[PDB]
């Protein structure tokens, strides 16, 4: 097999939902309160949510 | 983790039954990516056998 990947869907100071594509053995999970970065400083500026 | 993990009716059926135990863990803080844990490719172990 080979693991099919999707880019993370990120919303800053917001919330998201799950959209099931019904592809085989689909796994979708949502985690809140992250602090992601990119090269030119933090990707966003929120602290929570 | 063994034979039968991926089941497609033929070479170009464009559909498949998957039983491979994809379990999603939490990503690293301050890092954008999608880590995962699952069983090994059963074909690998069988062709080892």
């Amino acid at each position: 097999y080979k693991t099919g990947m999707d880019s993370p869907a990120i919303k800053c100071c917001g919330s998201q939902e799950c959209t099931p594509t019904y592809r085989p053995d689909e796994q979708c999970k949502v985690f809140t309160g992250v602090y992601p970065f990119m090269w030119g400083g933090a990707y966003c500026f929120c602290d929570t949510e | 983790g063994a034979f039968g993990d991926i089941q497609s009716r033929t070479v170009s059926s464009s559909d498949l039954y998957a039983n491979t135990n994809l379990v999603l863990q939490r990503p690293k803080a301050g890092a954008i990516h999608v880590p995962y844990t699952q069983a090994p490719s059963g074909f690998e172990q069988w062709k080892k056998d």
Partner: nanobody
Amino acid sequence: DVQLQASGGGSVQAGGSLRLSCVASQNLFEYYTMGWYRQVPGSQRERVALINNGGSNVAGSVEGRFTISRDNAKNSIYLQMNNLKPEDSAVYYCRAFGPADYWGQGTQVTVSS
């Protein structure tokens, strides 16, 4: 419960230097982003610097004078203050943010002209 114990605060003069140190009761940095927040008496807590595996970002008020470093093995984070000015006096709390949020009890920092 996980506890953040801050130390290194004290009394100094203008132009002096200090090094704060916050130590966590458990190995938590590998999953958390560490932060230092200052609170002037009567003011809201405001961020000083943040650090995680992606690097460190320091507040623009104290750019080039406050620098934050991390040490996962010792479970310690250090904030080296240099060239302090009278307005820097405040209670500094270390914050560990992740799935859960924990706030340090804080230490008093006083700097005199």
